[PDB]
Amino acid sequence: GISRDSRHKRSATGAKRAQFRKKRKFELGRQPANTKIGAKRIHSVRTRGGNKKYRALRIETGNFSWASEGISKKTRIAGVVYHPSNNELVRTNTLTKAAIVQIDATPFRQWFEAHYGQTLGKRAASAKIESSVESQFSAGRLYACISSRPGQSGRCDGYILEGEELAFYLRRLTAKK
Amino acid sequence: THFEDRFDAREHKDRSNKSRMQAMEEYIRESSDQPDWSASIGADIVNHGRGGIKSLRDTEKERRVTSFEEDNFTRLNITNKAEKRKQKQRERNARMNVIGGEDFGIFSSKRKLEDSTSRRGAKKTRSAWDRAQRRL
Amino acid sequence: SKGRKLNYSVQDPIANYEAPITSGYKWSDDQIDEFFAGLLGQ
Amino acid sequence: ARGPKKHLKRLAAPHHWLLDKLSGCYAPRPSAGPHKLRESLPLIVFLRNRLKYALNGREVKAILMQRHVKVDGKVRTDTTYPAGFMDVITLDATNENFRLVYDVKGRFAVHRITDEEASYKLGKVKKVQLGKKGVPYVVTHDGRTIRYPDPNIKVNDTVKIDLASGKITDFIKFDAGKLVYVTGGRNLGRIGTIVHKERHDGGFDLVHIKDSLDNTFVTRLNNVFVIGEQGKPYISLPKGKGIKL
């Protein structure tokens, strides 16, 4: 089976030691959920004790926040455009923690214009929001960072990027483009 | 730093019966001269004389198991392995050491008395001023 | 490395796991060689 | 093995019961309960071995659920309820109480206790913490979790609790110059005033204690229980004052 023992790595001396015991139950590693994007199908796992751990294998909708003014809504994801671990992962669009996604702009701009009254792009000081932010408002496609383990929580939480974060990720995309 | 601070069960336990050294116990009985609480003759002899009288140790052990009954109010039983072993050993030593109720394996043994005395033994005198203080 | 570097070495469990196979060509290889030359390159 | 253990030999019994070695082959395992097992006393030992009120296990079960023994106010129905250190066992049919306290030889000792002194029990305050709804709860050594305590209660304290209602009454904060009761370590059973403390973060907080032969000695802070000041105990201690001759 799939274990997470140390009973196979080399010693710090640099030699191979003896086999100790048959591999147990508690030292187990379960099967990795390559969570794709789609019709949300959740699967429950009974872990040690009576603990329930959820693995959603697909999803459309995640919970996203701005701390720019502190709002958070459930929205529909659109796509996977960056992730620091694996280019193949980014390619086949299997979302993970710390993933960079394109997300819809529609309910957020609806709230913004229903809360301020000012059309995006095209409370005055708070209405002067960031220029790249309102450009992505005009584009209708925002950049978010999924910052939650999906294959543990069975949830998908993200926050839309801000200045230096958005700056480095834009630089990453423009260097990789 | 680092240490343990645990209950010294073995040190709070006793070893006096381990270090008892019977010949000089007999002497210190003679010197400290309290009368002895010895028994009468029928209380002594064992089994229509098939065995010896008894040893003085065996008098003590019987008195103590009778005390277990005295307070604890329960007896022993016919448990196989342990009492067969102990009964055999004690009877073999009865037929090989005790003659007429006193024992001589105490001399045929090899436990010395200097390992008890040891020129004051524990917390011994090893300095000249310690000699001066003990002499005064 | 882990597996990136091409450790060219014989494998015992797949030594004769599918060794050998009879040459099931449905061709005689000769006109097909002329034909592969006379493919879209010509 | 596959889990916990349920049988245990006579020889492996903890010392502070002071048993024989061949009453049986297996010892009464303590039930899991309000005291740790390595420091607790089961009632069958208390009522079979020590006070000789009962002499066989079925008999002591018969009395226990004739429902006479009351522990810590409440009544028990366990053959192996884990009574612990500085605790209260009363009995109505003899009209008596017993505060259980450690001796100098590292063994338990009953104390014959009258009704009003048995009305209260002290507790080593382990820790207080802010629970839900922002309320405070205080936890002693013996699983005692009490809402709304004194704010002056800190960790490592001692609180006297009346038992007729399970409610805190009095408190003493450990400071320098207190009447300690040593409970663990090397030097269990030597009761006197403390000297002081050495602090060791990432480590231990040693306590120097000077007992009535004016002898100091060092013990772990975790082994500390607090009684009071010098010359005034809150417990009717027995004769001996924690002195071994």
Add this chain to the structure above:
Amino acid sequence: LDDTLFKDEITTFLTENGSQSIKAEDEKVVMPYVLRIFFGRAQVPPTSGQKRSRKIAVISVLPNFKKPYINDFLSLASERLDYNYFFGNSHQINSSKATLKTIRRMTGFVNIVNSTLSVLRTNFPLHTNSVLQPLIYSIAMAYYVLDTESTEEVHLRKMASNLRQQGLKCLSSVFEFVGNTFDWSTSMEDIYAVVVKPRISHFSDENLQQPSSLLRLFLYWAHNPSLYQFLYYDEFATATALMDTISNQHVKEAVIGPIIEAADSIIRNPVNDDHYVDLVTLICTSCLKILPSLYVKDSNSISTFLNLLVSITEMGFIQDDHVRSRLISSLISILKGKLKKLQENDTQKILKIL
């Protein structure tokens, strides 16, 4: 219609400009059905956590369709409701039906209108016959029960009081929210009658400890230049109660601050209309009873009222010897008080006042 598929299925197709939208004429046709089912899901009470999340989801879904659509929804709300007796008459209602069922319906309605304003704050519309009549309708019979019923009906009295509170709160919030999207001047008369009817009698000693919705309504009224219409419609009885509250010392700073803020909005904002001499008379009385304030009656409030007095002094439309004696006594009180938490330029504005 399914509950376990409700929210997810809404986000599946009912979300606009996404996957599986509904065509224009068809969606126009199937308005009423969506309206009825969402009214049912709102009428479901939020007695559990799931019902809470359901109600939150319902109100979050609603405002994304279109202005006439949500107007139709509000129209169905008014149609469950009514205003016919009160608005065929001036203010009387012949059928004395103020039953617990009626007020329960009223409270459900004010709950849903609170919900829709809170979700579509700076965007939702205001139809005339849709909001104005039921609001003052419900408030009118709320005060009717408050007046005509003793304490024997604790049930009626409690939920009539909460009905009154919610109606006043949502009236204040809709005033804050729409502002000037529409010509207000249709029912100024009837709404001002029902504002000056119940509470301006005892408005002094009713709310001093806490700010309230009518108080912040008067804040918005005196701050907004178009609601100088409201002020001139009054013979400043509400401003007289405001004088009473600011003279009383048992009033909170959260009340005091906005009052003089709107008073200086009156002061600095000019208007070429009648009763502005009454406005500046009120300003003179406000200076008269701001004399014992600000040192025996917060740093931000001190700085704010300092700036307001800076405005007052810098145009200086009051130049009487009495108001000047008030000004010099206020100056000696201010400069006697502790200003160590103030800054150099603000001190320089006080210096310019001097």
Add this chain to the structure above:
Amino acid sequence: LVTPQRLQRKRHQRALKVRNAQAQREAAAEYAQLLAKRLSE
């Protein structure tokens, strides 16, 4: 079938809930006066 035993049981348990809820409220109150006293001290 509904019985007076069931109804008295229901009344009894609801009574227990309201009384110990009230007791919790009293405990909160009495700790509040205690804490007020020991802050005033």
Add this chain to the structure above:
Amino acid sequence: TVQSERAFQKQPHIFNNPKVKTSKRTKRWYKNAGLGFKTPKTAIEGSYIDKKCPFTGLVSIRGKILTGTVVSTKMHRTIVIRRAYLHYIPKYNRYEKRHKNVPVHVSPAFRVQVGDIVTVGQCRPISKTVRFNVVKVSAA
């Protein structure tokens, strides 16, 4: 360059609002060890991002506190210290010298070269072969 790795190397659960302007760009969290040790100003102003840093990372130092002498400093962010201590051989009753070549993660806020009495403290397991983390420096 500080952010030269694949992902945005930042200290998590730390928010900076670009709306209200500030003096230093990111309000950097750092807590105290306690335990007799003092926080360093080099860490307080330290712009490095080390989640294994005992002061700025989210790691706890609770337990053994030892010290050692460094030999090699040729990794990234971690070193190996060698400690030759006395060992007792009772069947000869003779003393001997024995060195533990034990590693430890270091913070960049402390600059350590060969010939350093470094005082370290243990933590929860940091990597495969390390459970220590430096807190105190005395170079020579």
Add this chain to the structure above:
RNA sequence: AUACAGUGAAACUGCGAAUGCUCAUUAAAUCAGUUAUCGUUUAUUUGAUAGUCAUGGUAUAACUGUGGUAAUUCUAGAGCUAAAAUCUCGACCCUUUGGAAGAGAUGUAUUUAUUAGAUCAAUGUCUUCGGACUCUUUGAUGAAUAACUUUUCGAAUCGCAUGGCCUUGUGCUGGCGAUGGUUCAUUCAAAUUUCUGCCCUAUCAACUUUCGAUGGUAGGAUAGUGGCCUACCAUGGUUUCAACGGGUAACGGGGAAUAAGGGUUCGAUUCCGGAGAGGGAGCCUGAGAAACG
């Protein structure tokens, strides 16, 4: 007893059933000791702990009966049981027990973002002795929002009060004992983990990257850290203080174990360590199994 209450087979359901013999030999491995768990899990124990329909639907087993097949402990189809109080001020008295008009508020569980873990009394200084100061001390105070989700919930369950009131309805009301449930603590455990210790041999000087060897960063995975695993990388670590390697008869050793109440060192107990339960491979519950009936 015209609902039953005694008793009780068949069965539902709760919990236990995780405390069996045979075969293989490891020198920081194991074992003993000592940590840590501001890094985890816990059925059970005890201790606290949740104001947010005079009662809703089901079904079975058994039973009845009819059958099949050489045949199972095989099998068929048919009939069956809304509300609700509480906290915030305060308008008055009436001076006692204060009572209080009218003005505001009211779940947990999941997941994430945000937000949350400088002053004062005098007795002090000064004092003009009245007082100013908290400057200097004696003493005091601190240092939820936004949403997210298969809803978790806030008991449709057993033993006894019989009163009080009049609306005599058998109406209200109520008290003392069991089973469950929310969370936290505690208990029994468990997991890793610090460090301390065990033979002969250089006729063993090399070893590790040839499963990552060493470390970083990120993520998955796990109850939980950690190259445990994958990307992205850096190119390391151990070593004559002999690493490493070899043999060890390692039925070995552990003051592990009671000891030898006087055998010369000897008894008795305990830990061996792992694996197996035709043989490789895979899966399933439970708090705890990689259960091997």
